[PDB]
Structures are given as structure tokens and as C-alpha cells.
Subunit: 121 residues, 4 copies
């Protein structure tokens, strides 16, 4: 919880501002340093609020639809990963970014990637 709540950045310089509720909610804003995007976008997601005790990381995920007041890229990214607490805390994720497409173009609708988030404060 307090481990996850805070501000994180990935290797691209994007900014991930998240609040982890005691229920398992993730709420916050995302600012991508790249792509058809500017300023902050609403995010929401979920996380395992009772993780395993064997030293495993905490599973989690969240979504951003790339519409705000400034731009709309008609697409959405989901990040799926785990929080790994400790000396060098991090959120290791893989993501899927789907753009709305016509049916003829559906085969190329989805980008796949990976972001590593590390935390300040």
C-alpha cells in the first residue's frame, strides 16, 4: 500500500502518480514523455492488497485511455506487472497499447512493450 502509493518514473521519463487504496484500488494520473500525448491522463487499476509472504512481488495493473482536455489519441494502454518492494523498489511491467482501428487494420491494432518504474519519495 504505502509502498506503492507515490510518484514513479519509467525509463522513458514518463510520470506515474498513483494512490493505492487498502481495498485494492489504484487511482492517479499518468503523463507520458513520448507519443501522441501531453500533460496528465486519468488512470485506474487494481492490485493484490494481500500479497504472498514468500518474498514474491505484488501483482497489479492499470489502464490509461489516451483522452484528456488537450489531446485524444483514440487508444488505451494497460500495464500489467508487479511491485517489488525493498532496497531498490520498483514496478516491473509489460504493457499493451491498443488503438481503435477499422476491421481491415485490426491485425495491427496493438503495440506491446515493457516499462520499469522506479520511485522518488
Amino acid at each position: 500500500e504505502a509502498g506503492i502509493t507515490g510518484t514513479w518514473y519509467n525509463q522513458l521519463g514518463s510520470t506515474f502518480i498513483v494512490t493505492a487504496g487498502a481495498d485494492g484500488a489504484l487511482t492517479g494520473t499518468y503523463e507520458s514523455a513520448v507519443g501522441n500525448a501531453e500533460s496528465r491522463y486519468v488512470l485506474t487499476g487494481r492490485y493484490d492488497s494481500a500479497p504472498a509472504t514468500d518474498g514474491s512481488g505484488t501483482a497489479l495493473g492499470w489502464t490509461v485511455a489516451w483522452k484528456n482536455n488537450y489531446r485524444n489519441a483514440h487508444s488505451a494502454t494497460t500495464w500489467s506487472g508487479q511491485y517489488v518492494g525493498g532496497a531498490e523498489a520498483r514496478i516491473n511491467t509489460q504493457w499493451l497499447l491498443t488503438s481503435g482501428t477499422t476491421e481491415a487494420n485490426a491485425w495491427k491494432s496493438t503495440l506491446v512493450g515493457h516499462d520499469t518504474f522506479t520511485k522518488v519519495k
Copy 2:
């Protein structure tokens, strides 16, 4: 529209409400895996989609913990809603399990689900 009760090819049940400002909320019930009864989901969708006939982009997350079970895992679906006579939500998903560092290389499954308003 998006709000409704959807089923995928596995027989899983996706009950979702689309807010006017882009929020998705509801419950997910998986017919397979370490899962039982309903799980909370949240997500986002493009509340002002293109008019060129493109689908509506969206995504949502389920953390696989409820009062019945906890698989220490989370799935995210990324895809698009495609309107028409037979509405469909086409998705690909990433399912990540909490692992020790030794096992992180095998933390994540990938797959694809297609959702329809047709019951198993």
C-alpha cells in the same frame, strides 16, 4: 454500447458500466484458472472515439483477490469495442503473477479474449 454483460470464448462473465467521462467499473467472473465468483474490475475507455469507423479503445484490470481466493495475480485486458448488430470487444491480455526475483522471467502470460453478448 459498452455498458452491459459480456461473455468471452472461455465462458467468463464481464459485467461492466461505462461512465460518461471514461471510467469502466464492474465485476469479472473467470470460468478458468485459480478463480471463483466475482472480482472487482476498473478500467478506462475513449469516451470521444473517432468517426472514421474505427473501434473504441479500452482497457481494464482485475486483481485476482476476493473473499474466496487469492491467486496473487492481476490480468489487464487491452482492446477495442466494435459496435454494430453484433457488438464485440476484441482484446489481448497480460496476466502477471507476483514472483520472487528468481522467477520474474516467467511472471507473465499473454493471451487474447473476444467478448460478445452471446452466452456459453
Copy 3:
């Protein structure tokens, strides 16, 4: 082995002509019905030449680099999946399509998708 070798088609109408060697090699050509592609492209791959007997599918994979005499899309696709035998023979796959990019565009280098192949028939 005698199952995999053949001409397959996927849901896009692409043509996968493959030969499975006794040793585990896959060789042949791929013709995509969509994208920056025309005519046949060389593929190479591997498959499990001693599969389990519990009813599990046969694991396999292959690569096409999208360069031939006709075009060069500066891209490569890998299909990873399994062959499921029978009269209802199919190869179920997911794929990763990576394009060569500059460092600035690396985050968006890779598409992900899924193809299902069946025969003719």
C-alpha cells in the same frame, strides 16, 4: 512431423508453406495477405520433434524477416505456438512483429497479435 509439413492458411488469408525436418527444423515460405508484404518470404523455425503423449499440442515457432525481391518492410515477425493434430488440425499462435526503429521510436517498435492456421482441405 507428418502433421506439420504442409500448406496452411490463417484467418487473414495468409499462406504458410512449411516443411518439418526429422531433426526439429522448420523451413519454407510465408506469404502475407496484409501489410507491407507481397509474394513469398523465407521462413525458418523449430518445433518439438519428440512431443509429449498426454494429449498436449506440439510446441513450435518461426521467423519471417520481411525482405524479399519485391519489398523490404525492415521488420521481422515471430510466431510462437503449438500444433494441434487430428482431422481438425490447427496451429494456434501468437506473434511479435518488430520493426527496426531509431532509439526515439523504440518504445513503439513491436506489434503483438494472434493467428490461427488451418489447412486445405
Copy 4:
């Protein structure tokens, strides 16, 4: 450029010859999982890449059967070679295991490896 011995962040060993007309041939040794010693690999790469500073697209496959073990699985790596002072091969990979029809939804692992001339 590509021809040589590479290592990823797991300590796995990627020995590859890149042919002039686009073949990749070599052996792979994974430092993790149900595997031991070297496995045959084969793949393809763009033998006439763009000159705009873009990387060189490539891919290869390993079937996890050798003389020592058989994991009834196959991994494909998809990525690009980036030449230069910090030369590397950046990939994402898909690992499918043979499954029964009922377990097909969980047949495929997804991940990412970065290969350098350095080992960890």
C-alpha cells in the same frame, strides 16, 4: 555486426552466425528454467536495413529439446539489432508450451531480454 556471442540480463548465452542473405544460425543456452546446455536455434534478419539510423529487425526460435532434456516448449525472440558504441539486441519473446485444449489459455509466457556483449 550480429555474428558473435551475446548475453542477456539472465546470463543466457546466444551464439549466432548471421548469413549474408538473412539467415540466423547458432545455439542458445538458457541460464534459467527447464533447460540445460545448448539448444539449436534458427532465425532471420533484415540483411538490407534502413540507413536512417534505424535498428536491424530480426528474430529467432528455440525448441527446448536437446540431448539432455525436453521441456515440450518453444521460445521465439523478436527484436532489433542496434549497432554502435553501446551495441545490443533488444527483444521481446513468446514462450509457448504444448498444452491440452483445456489449458491452452495459459500456454504462452511473454517477456523481454536485452542482449549485450556483457554478461551478468
